[PDB]
Amino acid sequence: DQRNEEKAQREANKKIEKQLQKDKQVYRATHRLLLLGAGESGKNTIVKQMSGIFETKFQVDKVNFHMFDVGAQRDERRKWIQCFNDVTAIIFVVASSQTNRLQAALKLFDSIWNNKWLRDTSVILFLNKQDLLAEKVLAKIEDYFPEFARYTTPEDATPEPGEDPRVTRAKYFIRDEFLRISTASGDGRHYCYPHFTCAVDTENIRRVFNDCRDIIQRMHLRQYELL
Amino acid sequence: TASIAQARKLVEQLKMEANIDRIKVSKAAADLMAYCEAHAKEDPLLTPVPASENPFR
Amino acid sequence: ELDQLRQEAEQLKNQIRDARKACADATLSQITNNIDPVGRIQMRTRRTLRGHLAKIYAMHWGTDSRLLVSASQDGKLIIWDSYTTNKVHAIPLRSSWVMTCAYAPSGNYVACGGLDNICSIYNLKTREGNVRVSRELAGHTGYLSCCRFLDDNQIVTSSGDTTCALWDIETGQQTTTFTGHTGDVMSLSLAPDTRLFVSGACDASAKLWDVREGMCRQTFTGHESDINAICFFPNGNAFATGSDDATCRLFDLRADQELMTYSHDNIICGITSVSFSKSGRLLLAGYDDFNCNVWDALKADRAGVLAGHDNRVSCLGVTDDGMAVATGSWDSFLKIWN
Amino acid sequence: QVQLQESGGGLVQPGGSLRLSCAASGFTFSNYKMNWVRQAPGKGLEWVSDISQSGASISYTGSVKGRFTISRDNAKNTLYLQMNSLKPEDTAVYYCARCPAPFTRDCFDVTSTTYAYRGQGTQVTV
Amino acid sequence: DYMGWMDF
Amino acid sequence: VQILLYSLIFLLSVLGNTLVITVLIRNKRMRTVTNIFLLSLAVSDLMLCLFCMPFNLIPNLLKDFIFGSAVCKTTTYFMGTSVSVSTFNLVAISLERYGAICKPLQSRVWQTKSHALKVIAATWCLSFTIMTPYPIYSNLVPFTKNNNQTANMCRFLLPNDVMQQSWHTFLLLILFLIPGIVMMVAYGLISLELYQGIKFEASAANLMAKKRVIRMLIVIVVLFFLCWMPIFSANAWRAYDTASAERRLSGTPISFILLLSYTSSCVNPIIYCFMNKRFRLGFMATF
DSSP states along chain F: -HHHHHHHHHHHHHHHHHHHHHHHHH-SS--SHHHHHHHHHHHHHHHHHHHSSHHHHHHHHHS-----HHHHHHHHHHHHHHHHHHHHHHHHHHHHHHHHHTS-SSSTTS-SHHHHHHHHHHHHHHHHHHS--TTTEEEE-S--SSSS----EEEE--SSHHHHHHHHHHHHHHHTTHHHHHHHHHHHHHHHHHHHHHHHH--HHHHHHHHHHHHHHHHHHHHHHHTTHHHHHHHHHHHH-STTTTTTSSSSHHHHHHHHHHHHHHHHHHHTTTTSSHHHHHHHHH-
* Chains in contact with C, where contact requires at least 3 CB pairs less than 8 Å apart: A, B, D
Neighbours of F134 (CB within 10 A): 19
Of F59, F76, F145, the CB nearest to E1: F145
Measured between alpha carbons, how far is residue A71 from residues A44, A54, C159, C182 in Å? 11, 7, 16, 21
Q: CA D98 to CA D109: how far, in whole Å? A: 7
Inter-chain residue contact C12 with B14, CB threshold 8 Å? yes
Q: Cβ contacts (< 8 Å) between C74 and chain A: which residues?
A: 23, 27
Q: Are strands D18-25 and D78-83 parallel, antiparallel or unpaired?
A: antiparallel
Give the homologous superfamily in CATH for domain C1-337. Answer: YVTN repeat-like/Quinoprotein amine dehydrogenase (2.130.10.10)
- Give domain status of residue A118, yes or no: yes
Q: CA D108 to CA E1: how far, in whole Å? A: 86
Burial of residue C121 (CB within 10 Å: 0-12, 13-18, 19+) is buried
> CA-based angle A81:A87:A90, to the nearest 5?
65
Report helix, strand or coil for B8: helix
Which amino acid is residue C129, in one-letter code?
Answer: G
Which candidate, A97, A88, A87, places its Cα nearest to that of A38?
A97
Report helix, strand or coil for A84: helix
Measured over the CA atoms of residue A15, residue A19, residue A25 and residue A27, the dihedral's sign is negative
E strand intervals along chain A: 30-36, 54-60, 63-69, 89-94, 122-127
In sequence order, what are the beta bridge partners of C90? Answer: C78
Q: Are strands D78-83 and D70-73 parallel, antiparallel or unpaired?
A: antiparallel
Q: CA C32 to CA A205: how far, in whole Å? A: 65
Q: What is the total count of domains within chain A? A: 1
Report helix, strand or coil for C30: helix
DSSP 8-state code for residue C106: T
Which candidate, C244, C271, C222, C205, places its Cα nearest to that of D26?
C222
E strand or H helix that includes residue C144: strand C144-149
Q: CA C237 to CA F57: how far, in whole Å? A: 81
Q: Is C126 on the interface with B (CB under 8 A)?
A: no
Q: Are strands A89-94 and C154-159 parallel, antiparallel or unpaired?
A: unpaired
Q: Could you state, in order of their start, the residue ranges of all structural domains in chain C?
A: 1-337
Radius of gyration of chain C (CA): 20
Measured between alpha carbons, how far is residue F60 from residues C48, F149, F250 in Å? 54, 16, 9
Inter-chain residue contact A25 with F210, CB threshold 8 Å? no
C to B contact (≥3 Cβ pairs closer than 8 Å): yes
Burial of residue F197 (CB within 10 Å: 0-12, 13-18, 19+) is middle
Q: Is D116 on the interface with C (CB under 8 A)?
A: yes
Which amino acid is residue F53, in one-letter code?
Answer: M
E to A contact (≥3 Cβ pairs closer than 8 Å): no
Measured over the CA atoms of residue C234, residue C239, residue C242 and residue C246, the dihedral's sign is negative
Q: CA C79 to CA C68: how far, in whole Å? A: 6
* CB A101 within 8 Å of CB A40: yes
Inter-chain residue contact A191 with F206, CB threshold 8 Å? yes
Report helix, strand or coil for B26: helix
| D103 contact partners, CB below 8 Å, separation of at least 6 | C268, D31, D53
Which candidate, C80, C121, C116, places its Cα nearest to that of C98?
C116
Neighbours of C58 (CB within 10 A): 26
Q: CA A179 to CA A172: how far, in whole Å? A: 10
DSSP 8-state code for residue D89: G
Containing structural domain, residue A183:
30-220
Radius of gyration of chain F (CA): 21
Of B4, B31, B35, the CB nearest to C1: B4
Phi, psi of D50, deg, nearest 5: -145, 160
Helices (H), B1-57: 4-16, 25-38
Size of chain D, expressed as the number of residues it contains: 126
State how far residue F245 is from chain E, nearest Cα, in angstroms. Answer: 9
Interface of A with F in 9-38 (CB under 8 A): 25, 28-29, 31
Neighbours of C100 (CB within 10 A): 25
Domains of chain D: 3-124 (2.60.40.10)
Measured between alpha carbons, how far is residue C312 from residues A80, C270, F166 in Å? 16, 11, 61
In sequence order, what are the beta bridge partners of C260? Answer: C250
Sheet containing C196-201: order of strands:
C185-190, C196-201, C205-210, C215-221
Query: Taking the CA of residue C50 as centre, how many other CA atoms within 13 Å lie in the half-sphere pointing to its CB?
Result: 5
E to D contact (≥3 Cβ pairs closer than 8 Å): no
Size of chain B, expressed as the number of residues it contains: 57
Neighbours of A219 (CB within 10 A): 16
The CATH number given to whatever domain includes residue A82 is 3.40.50.300
* CB A191 within 8 Å of CB A179: no
Hey, of D32, D39, D106, which one would you mutate to test binding to chain A, going by the most A CBs within 10 A of its CB?
Answer: D106
- Give domain status of residue A15, yes or no: no
| D73 contact partners, CB below 8 Å, separation of at least 6 | none
Measured between alpha carbons, how far is residue A156 from residues A177, A184, F195, F199 in Å? 16, 21, 21, 15
E strand or H helix that includes residue A220: helix A204-220
In sequence order, what are the beta bridge partners of D24? Answer: D4
Interface of E with F in 1-8 (CB under 8 A): 1-8
* CB B44 within 8 Å of CB C41: no
Helices (H), chain C: 2-23, 28-32
Q: CA A7 to CA D43: how far, in whole Å? A: 68
Which candidate, C294, C302, C306, C246, places its Cα nearest to that of C270?
C246
Which amino acid is residue C186, in one-letter code?
Answer: M
In sequence order, what are the beta bridge partners of A68? Answer: A34, A55
* CB A163 within 8 Å of CB A134: yes
Q: Cβ contacts (< 8 Å) between F217 and chain A: which residues?
A: none
* CB C222 within 8 Å of CB C229: no
Phi, psi of A146, deg, nearest 5: -65, -30
Radius of gyration of chain D (CA): 14
Q: CA D6 to CA A49: how far, in whole Å? A: 48
DSSP 8-state code for residue A40: S
Inter-chain residue contact A145 with D100, CB threshold 8 Å? no
Q: CA F136 to CA F155: how far, in whole Å? A: 9
Q: Cβ contacts (< 8 Å) between C225 and chain D: which residues?
A: 100-102
Q: How many CB pairs under 8 A join A and C?
A: 80
Q: Is A63 on the interface with F (CB under 8 A)?
A: yes
Report helix, strand or coil for A210: helix
Inter-chain residue contact C16 with B17, CB threshold 8 Å? yes
Interface of A with F in 154-193 (CB under 8 A): 183, 188, 191
Measured over the CA atoms of residue B25, residue B30, residue B35 and residue B36, the dihedral's sign is positive
* CB C93 within 8 Å of CB C110: no
Q: CA F71 to CA F138: how far, in whole Å? A: 9
Q: CA C35 to CA C299: how far, in whole Å? A: 8
Q: CA C50 to CA C335: how far, in whole Å? A: 9
C to D contact (≥3 Cβ pairs closer than 8 Å): yes
In sequence order, what are the beta bridge partners of C147? Answer: C157
Neighbours of F194 (CB within 10 A): 21
In sequence order, what are the beta bridge partners of F16? Answer: none
Size of chain A, expressed as the number of residues it contains: 227
E strand intervals along A83-141: 89-94, 122-127
Phi, psi of F218, deg, nearest 5: -70, -35
* CB C180 within 8 Å of CB C206: no
Phi, psi of A119, deg, nearest 5: -75, 5
* CB B35 within 8 Å of CB C297: no
Taking phi first (over 0 means left), then psi (-120 to 50 degrees means alpha), and beta for anything else, what does residue E6 get? left
Measured between alpha carbons, how far is residue B21 from residues A119, C19, F75, F81 in Å? 49, 10, 90, 85
Q: CA A202 to CA A35: how far, in whole Å? A: 17
Neighbours of F3 (CB within 10 A): 11
Which amino acid is residue C141, in one-letter code?
Answer: T
Q: Cβ contacts (< 8 Å) between A75 and chain D: which residues?
A: 111-113
| B51 contact partners, CB below 8 Å, separation of at least 6 | B57
Q: CA D111 to CA D37: how far, in whole Å? A: 11
* CB F39 within 8 Å of CB F21: yes
Phi, psi of A214, deg, nearest 5: -60, -30
Sheet containing C247-252: order of strands:
C227-232, C239-243, C247-252, C257-263
Query: Taking the CA of residue F68 as centre, how many other CA atoms within 13 Å lie in the half-sphere pointing to its CB?
Result: 1
> CA-based angle F183:F186:F192, to the nearest 5?
135
Taking phi first (over 0 means left), then psi (-120 to 50 degrees means alpha), and beta for anything else, what does residue F150 get? beta
Hey, of D2, D3, D5, which one would you mutate to test binding to chain C, going by the most C CBs within 10 A of its CB?
Answer: D2
| A91 contact partners, CB below 8 Å, separation of at least 6 | A33, A34, A35, A36, A46, A67, A124, A126, A208
Inter-chain residue contact D101 with C225, CB threshold 8 Å? yes
Inter-chain residue contact F276 with A63, CB threshold 8 Å? no
Q: Could you state, in order of their start, the residue ranges of all structural domains in chain F?
A: 1-287
Inter-chain residue contact C184 with A16, CB threshold 8 Å? no
Measured between alpha carbons, how far is residue F4 from residues F8, F53, F178, F268 in Å? 6, 13, 36, 21
Inter-chain residue contact C99 with A27, CB threshold 8 Å? no
Size of chain F, expressed as the number of residues it contains: 287
Q: Is C307 on the interface with B (CB under 8 A)?
A: no
| F40 contact partners, CB below 8 Å, separation of at least 6 | F85, F89, F120, F123
Q: CA F283 to CA F23: how far, in whole Å? A: 8
Measured over the CA atoms of residue C153, residue C156, residue C159 and residue C165, the dihedral's sign is positive
State how far residue A164 is from chain F, nearest Cα, in angstroms. Answer: 26
State how far residue D103 is from chain C, nearest Cα, in angstroms. Answer: 8
Which candidate, C135, C58, C54, places its Cα nearest to that of C101?
C58
Q: CA F169 to CA C70: how far, in whole Å? A: 60
Q: What is the total count of domains within chain B? A: 1
In sequence order, what are the beta bridge partners of C164? Answer: C158, C178
* CB C154 within 8 Å of CB C109: no
Q: Is D16 on the interface with C (CB under 8 A)?
A: no
Size of chain E, expressed as the number of residues it contains: 8
Taking phi first (over 0 means left), then psi (-120 to 50 degrees means alpha), and beta for anything else, what does residue A33 get? beta
**Closest residue in chain E to residue F256, using alpha carbons only:** E5
Q: CA C67 to CA A128: how far, in whole Å? A: 51
* Chains in contact with E, where contact requires at least 3 CB pairs less than 8 Å apart: F
Inter-chain residue contact A79 with C53, CB threshold 8 Å? no
Which candidate, D19, C238, C222, places its Cα nearest to that of B30?
C238
Interface of F with A in 84-103 (CB under 8 A): 100-101
Q: Is C66 on the interface with A (CB under 8 A)?
A: no
DSSP 8-state code for residue A65: E
> CA-based angle A216:A222:A223, to the nearest 5?
115
| C146 contact partners, CB below 8 Å, separation of at least 6 | C100, C157, C158, C185, C186, C187, C188, C199
E strand or H helix that includes residue A165: helix A165-185
Report helix, strand or coil for D61: coil
Inter-chain residue contact D100 with A78, CB threshold 8 Å? yes
DSSP 8-state code for residue B40: G
Q: CA A115 to CA A189: how far, in whole Å? A: 13
Inter-chain residue contact D111 with A100, CB threshold 8 Å? no
Q: CA F203 to CA F110: how far, in whole Å? A: 30
> CA-based angle C175:C176:C181, to the nearest 5?
155
D to A contact (≥3 Cβ pairs closer than 8 Å): yes
DSSP 8-state code for residue D118: B
State how far residue D105 is from chain A, nearest Cα, in angstroms. Answer: 6
Phi, psi of A156, deg, nearest 5: -75, 10
In sequence order, what are the beta bridge partners of D47? Answer: D37
Per residue in F23-58, is it b (16+ CB within 10 Å) or e — as a string?
bbeebeebeebbbbbbbbbbbbbbbbbbbbbeebbe
* CB F137 within 8 Å of CB F72: yes
Inter-chain residue contact C226 with A27, CB threshold 8 Å? no
DSSP 8-state code for residue C93: P
Which candidate, C248, C193, C196, places its Cα nearest to that of C222?
C248
**Long-range contacts at F74-79 (CB < 8 A, ≥ 24 apart):** F74/F134, F75/F51, F76/E6, F76/E7, F76/F134, F76/F137, F76/F154, F76/F156, F77/F131, F77/F134, F77/F137, F78/F47, F78/F51, F79/E7, F79/E8, F79/F48, F79/F51, F79/F52, F79/F55
Measured over the CA atoms of residue A214, residue A219, residue A220 and residue A225, the dihedral's sign is positive
User: What is the residue-wise DSSP string for A169-209?
Assistant: HHHHHHHHHHHHHHHHH--SS--B------SS-TTHHHHHH
* CB C305 within 8 Å of CB C320: no
Which candidate, D115, D108, D94, places its Cα nearest to that of D48?
D94
